[PDB]
Amino acid sequence: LNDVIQDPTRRNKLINDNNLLKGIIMGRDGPVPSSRELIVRPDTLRAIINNRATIETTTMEAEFTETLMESNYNSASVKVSAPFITANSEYSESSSFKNTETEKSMYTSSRYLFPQGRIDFTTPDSGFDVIKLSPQFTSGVQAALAKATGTEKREALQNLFQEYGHVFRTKVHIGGVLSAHTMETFSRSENETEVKQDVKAGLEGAVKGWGGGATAGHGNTQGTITTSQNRKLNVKYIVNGGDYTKIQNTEEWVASTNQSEHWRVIEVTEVTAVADLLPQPIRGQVKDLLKPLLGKWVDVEKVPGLESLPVSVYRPKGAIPAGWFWLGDTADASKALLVKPTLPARSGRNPALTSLHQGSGMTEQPFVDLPQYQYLSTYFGSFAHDTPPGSTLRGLRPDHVLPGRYEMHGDTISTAVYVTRPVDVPFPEDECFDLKSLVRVKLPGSGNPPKPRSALKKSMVLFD
Amino acid sequence: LNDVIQDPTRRNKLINDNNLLKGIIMGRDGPVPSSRELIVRPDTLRAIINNRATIETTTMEAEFTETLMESNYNSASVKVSAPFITANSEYSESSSFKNTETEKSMYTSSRYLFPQGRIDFTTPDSGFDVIKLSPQFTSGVQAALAKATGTEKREALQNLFQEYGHVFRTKVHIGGVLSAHTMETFSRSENETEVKQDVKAGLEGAVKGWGGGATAGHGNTQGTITTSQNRKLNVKYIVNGGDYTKIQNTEEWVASTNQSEHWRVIEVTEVTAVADLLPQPIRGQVKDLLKPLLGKWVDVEKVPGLESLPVSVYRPKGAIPAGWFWLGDTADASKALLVKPTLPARSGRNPALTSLHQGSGMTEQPFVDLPQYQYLSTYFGSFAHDTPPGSTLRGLRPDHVLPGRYEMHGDTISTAVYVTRPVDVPFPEDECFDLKSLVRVKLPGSGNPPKPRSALKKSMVLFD
Ligand SMILES: [Cl-]
Ligand SMILES: [Cl-]
């Protein structure tokens, strides 16, 4: 029983085995627990009893989240952890996750939970026993903010989060779990609702058949499933908790999930960013210093030889200050945003920006130098990385951008352009800049790069 | 002091004066407290001490939220309350809130908070003292679910929420507040970021000048402000808490906010839907019965005489069952969604669906019979409300839809169409159906209705 475990020193076994005192490092190797304790060891754990077995499913369209899906993070935990795994991922041109003009990808994870309960860590500035950060971490923050220069403070803070972790798990389900994980690539011509429901039912069916003893028993393995609509899927099967030596006989493994010794984290229900646990004044100072870009609003000038276009095309009217960069052609006649990276370049660290090169095809459009980086606008001219204004044009690390929305302008497809705006959902969780990024509807020639449809996140840019 | 008030019977004065035990009715007259108690009177209130005065701002693009903005609900509370005020609002063709092809509107509220603390009501199935629903409400739910037919159960549940409320305030700030509320209509050609920041700084400046004693003192009133960018705004000034008889001398009012007797709710920090407070089995039964539409997937047939179009146009292949309705022309060659309302028509109650009429202009497109209702597709032909398939075509109540996203198709503007898809944000709070709703890029003739860009919410449709 959950209440029984929380009473003596066996609650310390539950805390220690599950790394409940440690922040989670979001890196290229997936979610990794810190070797250092983030919080002070509590006298008691806040537990909600729930022994009801259920099948839960998570559908995820965000790239770089596969290791979080496989660690049974729910959508709310993936959301908070997503900028950190994205920023620290190993980018590749050969990824199977495809987001093209004709195709899209998604991850689907189903989990047959055999729980005992939920453990809650009360965050500071919330009603309740509350989280107390370890003095070792607090001293690290103080030592980081005490550095002579802005660059030194940011480098020490970066080192501090790489050691302590990016997020802390504030709500976790404890018990045993049998989970199935998949990825699917489908045509944009398909009904998204039909594809999602078909993959979810097929995955739920596989975990349902595995759990409760109906299919041939197995442990951690790879398998293939066929949905009702004939989609063939590569499935990864994962076991967490219970006695793994008993996994061959499903019902014997299920019974072993009632043993306090074999209880493990079975779902990450809620996660909090480590910087958000910091007290009120320091919190804002740390968060400002963590922003990868500096921002500046500057004057614009109209691009000549664009009389054919339905709208006026703009670029910063510089005199672009040394070390500053621009992000693409705009329909904003008033101002342009310039950006400057706050962190020095280091081997193993993904920079906030990437330079661009003209494509080897018949095209004159830029291509990102660093794989999987994104840019905001089509280039209205002939790009060259060695000549202005292309020499100071930059692409962005994928954690910096979210999908935008097009507003089409033009009386002919050949002259037609899209003006990128932030999505107009009434209750956004994240806010983006309205930069009025210009995208060509029909680009001339072949070998042209995928058309951008992105908006820059406001949380990534520090002003003044 | 907050801790001092919570100890004797003066905590009951704080609970009673602020209606902390009552659900909030979201109707045409704004947020109205229920006359009936939703929860059992607690022995103690969970309080977080915070006497730090701050200026907070909320920007809201959602229509029908003005009375929530004026009641100092933050964006998270507006979000949860929004479907309920939208569904119960008094619709009008003469609203100043404009969302056209060339213009958009938004609400901005700034509040100069003079707090004492925050009161938290712990929801059932959450760590902590927890909420216990009143036996009068619980008996009402049981009596509603005991009705002979589906229609009778739904009517009794509707009556139950109109009496008890749609939402419950789970986190509230207590003290005194000076707030300014405005609305702004601007051209889509404008930078949204610049407009939002300009209105927020102008509104923050007005509350800053009012509070702390710098401008001429006043109480609840209407005024005009001018932003840094020469935008002229109609401002509504509201006072909550403190001694209102002392409002003329700002500093005397500020000092009166430290008196336990004058503490009022100053911000609605978190709100929970009343149905979400219900225990696990009943919760799902109530939520299914509250859905305004029944759903059914049916076969489609291609619309003839559409050879010129870049895509195939579809309508349900009916034999449309009696009492069922369709929602517009689609590019979905496999299936079509049919809808049926679950509640009977009643005077004063906004129906889930509206019939349509052909516009009096040169147009052949349908127009909603009920003001402010929305539809999903342009009609690919000549609409008539008295002939099939137009006789069974229906528009939707604004709470049923969210903005969608266009995917353009066509080699000529005149033949070009948009296929509506759900927004592709990676972490949506709300999910919509992908219906592949077809919208004409360039409609022939004048007097044509505003082009739709909407997706139907999945939470509004009950299947099987
Ligand atoms: Cl290339
Ligand atoms: Cl009309």
Residue numbers in the entry:
A (entry chain A), B (entry chain A): 55 to 182, 184 to 519
Give me lines lifted from the publication on this model.
Previous studies have shown that PlyA binds membranes and is required to recruit the pore-forming MACPF protein PlyB to the membrane surface. PlyA and PlyB together form relatively small and regular pores in liposomes.
The 2.2 Å structure of PlyB reveals an N-terminal MACPF domain (blue/red/yellow) followed by three small β-rich domains clustered in a globular trefoil-like arrangement (green). TMH2 (yellow) comprises a single large α-helix and an additional β-strand (termed “strand β5”), located on the edge of the central β-sheet. Together, the central β-sheet and the TMH regions constitute the topologically conserved MACPF/CDC pore-forming fold. A single PlyB moiety was fitted into the upper part of the pore structure.
